[PDB]
């Protein structure tokens, strides 16, 4: 697997707006709500459970980095993977996506895989 | 880098009168860690080495002969000497202790009135 | 009584060097940091530098860095100070204080008048 | 008045 | 078990106003104390013991999120599970609650299990 | 054990004025000097070792909490359990107490075990 | 090995412009692109993978620094090692060189290997 | 062994100026540079590796502290142990000292072993 696969989607000019650290099934998790830096589009959510999916080892690294971009408020481009989480009350709460990466964004283009 | 503006440069009071002596620095001297003011007052009779008078801008030394206690401000101090006698004609200096680069004031000379 | 003792007056030629001393007795020599001060004819004091008698960890002024050198003797219980490239505007009296743990100098020397002329 | 630069690097780090 | 179960209560628009750390029975913990937005209601102490409850895995993730919110001092929403740690004197000191979740609240609506 | 036993002590309205991280017996230690919030009293020191006492399971929680209470320089309450470490050079240099918790003082009074 | 042998390479006076953390082949990784602070030269991109290189153990240390120098914006002497990766598509988007070190370059000298 | 033995040196009233991270002998290594904070002196370099000396159990606690003092640029007393590292290409580039402690120095007096 990779972060810049064609199967994985990407959303550009995403400013992280929220954060939520809980625990489900003896494993913590976190979910971010990224919003466009212009006012267009829809806010997309990308959770990351500690040890549930294939994107398990990068939970700690993506939690330190999700708190950096959420504090400084800089626009970044996020990549996700759709239809991952399947718990009923969990998907209806945040999303079914899985946060796979976090690329910084310059004034012209992003520093990410295309 | 911390300047000390002592004033007046030369003073003369009559015996039996209270005496004021002002000082000023470019920045505050209260340390939020030690919770003290790091300024002192010295006395130097002509031909003699100076002698400490106040510890932390408000508490005199062991042998002090009932002197004054400077105003516990940030960068503004007064009331160095008191009860002028026949032997209180000396040079009164000031000094910082906010860092290891100790900066001394200009000075002050007491005399007699006619 | 704790008291510091310095050398007598000095008189040298411009361009020479001088070694001032500061003898202390009555306490453990490696307890108080000893500074060095210069008092011109205008009575305004100016620190030269300090040195910890334990480590000899010295630190000089931004103006006397290329002019002075501090040295501490732990055996003879005395300090030193060298002054090279002496010019006519380096004539003053040099003191030797000691830092009490309260951040003040209770013990001073006795003065050392240094004059340079031809 | 405390410098916020170490206090900010304290909560963001790790 | 989930952070957003029905047996868990939550309080919105809280502000983490006090952070107390410590240790009981060879296990560290932390009992935050949170007040409301405009000083209404009552304070809510919510401990989190490292190795005593079933919410033990998320002790490290909840500590870093409860410290980031205590420092910035912004709106949050805490989820707790009442009636734990029957120890007599402990409950009299802080509470009979356990910190289960910490969501980041926006101006209008929060972000987490309602 | 517990921070607020009847065999402990507490110093409200103190300030962590200094901080020294080191190592003793292949075990990192950290000490803190607590001066009163108004400069009165005597310097109270209380170290903490990583794998020496029975309060060892809370070293990393107290090192990160002291390092944050030292940055903000605010008023706290330091819980100590005296007569723990018997290394004479360590005692006369630092203390004989033992850091067993760190509360957060408020405008009214401190929150934590009395 | 070391980040300063002739088999390595560096780009002095650089400034960390972008940073990207993700997950490749069940392993986290991070990459930075380095541009000057005066609008000159061609940007230099480095990478480091958590467990798919010889720069595996220092992944957490380099991530702490690459995220610190990225926030201070100071001029950084950033070292690399050429032709260490093998994934053909991974190189076509970020880089082929490794990230080995992160000095702190001064306006006159450069505290680092050269 | 102890940080404050008579065999350890210490340079009081220093400020950390330049940082550097890397990896040597498959072990990560950071390094700091210090200059006198009050006018002049001799610059001293000293730093530790993660798995080399007897101070290895403290690499994680000292790296988090050396980056705390490099961030604020304050006066600190550094305890070192001279002639530790032996790699000629790295001894001649940085130093032969090993960081063994990091005290926090007040206005004129420091807090640590002497």
XYZ file of C-alpha atoms in Angstrom, chain F residues 19-90:
72
model
C 14.905 22.476 37.127
C 17.825 20.045 36.848
C 17.661 16.853 34.770
C 20.387 14.266 35.259
C 21.048 10.628 36.128
C 22.014 8.585 39.192
C 22.636 4.816 39.326
C 21.714 4.275 35.648
C 18.383 5.962 36.349
C 17.473 9.508 35.086
C 16.458 11.846 37.935
C 14.963 15.366 37.930
C 14.800 17.906 40.770
C 12.809 21.109 41.218
C 13.380 24.051 43.561
C 10.164 25.549 44.925
C 10.273 29.137 46.178
C 7.193 30.718 47.716
C 4.929 32.686 45.389
C 5.762 35.817 47.428
C 9.489 35.166 47.880
C 9.129 34.254 51.566
C 9.899 30.917 53.206
C 12.825 28.629 52.443
C 13.754 26.858 49.183
C 11.979 23.488 49.254
C 13.518 20.904 46.920
C 12.015 17.539 45.977
C 13.601 15.248 43.394
C 12.226 12.182 41.610
C 14.026 9.091 40.334
C 12.855 6.802 37.558
C 13.458 3.339 39.050
C 14.379 3.749 42.727
C 11.420 4.333 45.054
C 7.864 2.965 45.144
C 6.758 6.116 43.280
C 8.820 5.108 40.244
C 5.839 4.196 37.951
C 5.118 7.935 37.624
C 8.473 9.364 36.557
C 7.626 10.296 32.959
C 4.298 11.770 34.085
C 6.024 14.032 36.629
C 8.942 14.989 34.376
C 6.606 16.267 31.649
C 4.346 17.990 34.196
C 7.142 19.776 36.052
C 8.701 20.877 32.752
C 5.363 22.472 31.834
C 4.737 24.017 35.264
C 8.289 25.387 35.117
C 7.664 27.101 31.774
C 4.441 28.845 32.801
C 5.930 29.608 36.224
C 2.494 29.554 37.846
C 1.633 28.640 41.438
C 1.229 24.958 42.324
C 1.231 22.560 45.274
C 4.112 20.085 45.482
C 3.447 16.892 47.442
C 6.518 15.434 49.157
C 7.223 12.244 51.101
C 10.349 12.975 53.122
C 13.158 10.590 54.104
C 13.278 8.424 50.981
C 16.709 8.714 49.360
C 19.723 8.288 51.637
C 22.626 9.242 49.333
C 24.343 11.902 51.482
C 25.834 13.917 48.613
C 22.430 13.843 46.910
